[PDB]
Structure 1
Amino acid sequence: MELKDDDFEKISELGAGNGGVVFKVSHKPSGLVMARKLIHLEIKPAIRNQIIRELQVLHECNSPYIVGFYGAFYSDGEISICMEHMDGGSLDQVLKKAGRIPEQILGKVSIAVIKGLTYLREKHKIMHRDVKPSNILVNSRGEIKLCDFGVSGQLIDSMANSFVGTRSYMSPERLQGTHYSVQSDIWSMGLSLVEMAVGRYPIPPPDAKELELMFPPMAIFELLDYIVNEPPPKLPSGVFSLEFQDFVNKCLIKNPAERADLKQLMVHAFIKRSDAEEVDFAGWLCSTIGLN
């Protein structure tokens, strides 16, 4: 069925962050609850047609690790992406409630991010371009899915960009120039996992007394200079398994050719161990964020 603006009904607002605002909506003719993201763009009619045309490949992006898509359309200065409503929200939101996400749970997430990225790469020859906790979605069925990946190049271009400034998940190479590709997503995942594991954006790293308590903010140039020139972030020892520690280290190597790739991580000790693990993520999620 084709989706049109007048067939939806707002339920609640899910967020923004930015350019694009996302609401929880009821598609009146199906009865389905969807999450509709509207992106306001001052764009010519020919290239907004290109954006919609390119977005149609989302109908072919079906994977347990990729957020479901319903349809894409243009309304009144806004392009709409109607997708599966993830009743658990983003990992950024669950981290706010959790304070800290456990290692076992982070193993289940890591498995989903690698499998999600492998899917987009193998099946669709596309890179995520923005792997961070808010673009990693969860639900009460215990599902961990990716969204906000760069399926449309023209949309990628049209939405720009640097809306940070105390948190950048950009790899040192992407921060430094045009010399980036799929390896950038590895870094972003690596950084995201350290954040969720420790309970805060890991730059600047925490001191002796800061880590003791757990277990003013930074200027844009200070943070970016840290990323590109200072040694990469690490997981604190003792509190985390050597397997997780090595895994994040492999992800956060500043040299993208030295950095581990999806292939290597997929067979990493940490992943192999998490795959064996019997983890009720669904039950953990609902009890920590307040659902079931």
Structure 2
Amino acid sequence: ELKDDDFEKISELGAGNGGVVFKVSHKPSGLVMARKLIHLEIKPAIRNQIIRELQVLHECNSPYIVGFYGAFYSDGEISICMEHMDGGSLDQVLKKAGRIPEQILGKVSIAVIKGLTYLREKHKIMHRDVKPSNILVNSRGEIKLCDFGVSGQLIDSMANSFVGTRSYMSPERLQGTHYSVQSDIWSMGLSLVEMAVGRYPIPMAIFELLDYIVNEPPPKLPVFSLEFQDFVNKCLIKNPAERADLKQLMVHAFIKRSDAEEVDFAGWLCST
């Protein structure tokens, strides 16, 4: 029940490849929500299938997944209306914070591996694009995941995804088609490491960045705590089967001392 005209544009939270979200007002309910607009050059049939498989998001309910209000089509634009996250993305936070704690990243990590196990064990789907620009947090202290693959057809229309300048892509997934869930870990790994070093931990046009990632060894860290090495790295193992699976890390030592401890996060964000 969300039509294009019951929407009033306020600003522009951000953009990217094919997408571009805005902060908008749903005129008829007064609610403030983020309106993603993917474009994609697709036909009516495939499109309707994308708009259809996107309804699954009404059953994607968890403190770790961004809230979703509706999805629909309008002028070559697939709209995905999700909750507004005033606190932006752990990417934006970065750009304005040089680097992030650990007592904190241990919290941003519980978010992620609890939101991944959710998507994997209640919707049988892997994220497939977990990274900072896709990890959002709110002023209320919450941390949630967004932009995950929920529409198989949307994942097929996004085939030309090896563009950009960075790449949270695991090695086995850059080599060919031998990959799945374990790939999300290398992603989260290459994230935690970047949210501890204020810059893409790797080490050059993308064709060369890719080749490098599969050839030489995975990043580590510069200076940094305990487990945040025996975790950031149990995440960067280039062999997918030797890397740690969610089950494991959900009991790993770094995680051990964290949901146990009591960091605020809220205030840190609110004042960072």
Measured against the shorter chain, the TM-score band is over 0.9
- Do 1:91 and 1:134's aligned partners in 2 also have CA atoms closer than 8 Å? yes
Structure 1 residues 230-264: Cα deviation after superposition (integer angstroms, max 9, x where no partner): 0111022xx22121110011000000000000000
Seen in structure 2, the aligned counterparts of structure 1 residues 43 and 221 have a Cα distance that, compared at 3 Å, is: closer
| Deviations 1:150-203 (CA, angstroms, capped at 9, x unpaired) | 000101111243364431110000000000100110000000110011111001
What per-residue deviation string (whole Å, max 9, x for no partner) do you get for residues 7-43 of structure 1? 1000101111120110000001111100001111222
Change (3 A) 1:41 1:150: same
Equivalence for 1:220: 206
Q: CA deviation at 1:272?
A: 1.0
Write out aligned runs for 1:145-160 (5 A): 145-160=144-159
Distance 1:47 1:59 in 2: 21
Deviation, 1:266, is 0.3
The 8 Å contact of residues 23 and 37 in structure 1, kept in 2 or not, is answered as yes
TM superposition shift of 1:44: 1.5
CA distance in 2, matches of 1:42, 1:222: 28
Structure with the largest fraction of helix: 1
Deviates more, 1:134-143 or 1:153-162: 153-162
- Residues paired across the two proteins, number: 272
Question: Per the alignment, in what secondary structure is the counterpart of residue 192 of structure 1?
Answer: helix
Tell me by how many angstroms 1:46 deviates.
1.4
Asked if the contact 1:19/1:159 (under 8 Å) is kept, the reply is: no
SS at match of 2:11: strand
**Which of 252, 259, 264 is the aligned partner of 2:243?**
259
Deviations 1:99-157 (A, max 9, x none): 10111110000000000000000000001110110000011000000000000010111
Contact residue 35 and residue 83 of structure 1 kept, 8 A: yes
% of aligned pairs identical?
100
- Farther off after superposition, 65-74 or 220-229: 220-229
Superimposed CA distance per residue, residues 37-67 of structure 1 (whole angstroms, 9 cap, x where no aligned partner): 1111222211111111100000000000000
Instruction: Measure, in 2, the Cα distance between the counterparts of 1:17 and 1:165.
Output: 9
Give the alignment partner of residue 230 of structure 1, picking from 216, 232, 246. 216
Q: Following TM superposition, by how much is the alpha carbon of 1:225 offset from its aligned partner in structure 2, in angstroms? A: 2.1
Which deviates more, 257-266 or 222-231? 222-231
- Listed as ranges, the gaps of 5+ residues in structure 1 are 204-216
Matches of residues 14-25 of structure 1 in structure 2 within 5 Å? 14-25=13-24
Residue 244 of structure 1 corresponds to 228
1:280 to 246, 264, 267: 264
The 8 Å contact of residues 90 and 137 in structure 1, kept in 2 or not, is answered as yes
Q: Is the 8 A contact 1:186 1:261 kept in 2?
A: yes
CA distance in 2, matches of 1:170, 1:255: 13
Query: What secondary structure does 2:71 align onto?
Result: strand
Shift in Å at residue 220 of structure 1? Answer: 2.3
Seen in structure 2, the aligned counterparts of structure 1 residues 166 and 40 have a Cα distance that, compared at 3 Å, is closer
Q: CA deviation at 1:268?
A: 0.3
CA–CA distance in 1 between the matches of 2:28 and 2:164? 42
* Alpha-carbon distance, 1:226 to partner: 2.0
Partner Cα distance (1:73, 1:233) in 2? 40
Does the 8 A contact of 1:194 with 1:202 survive in 2? yes
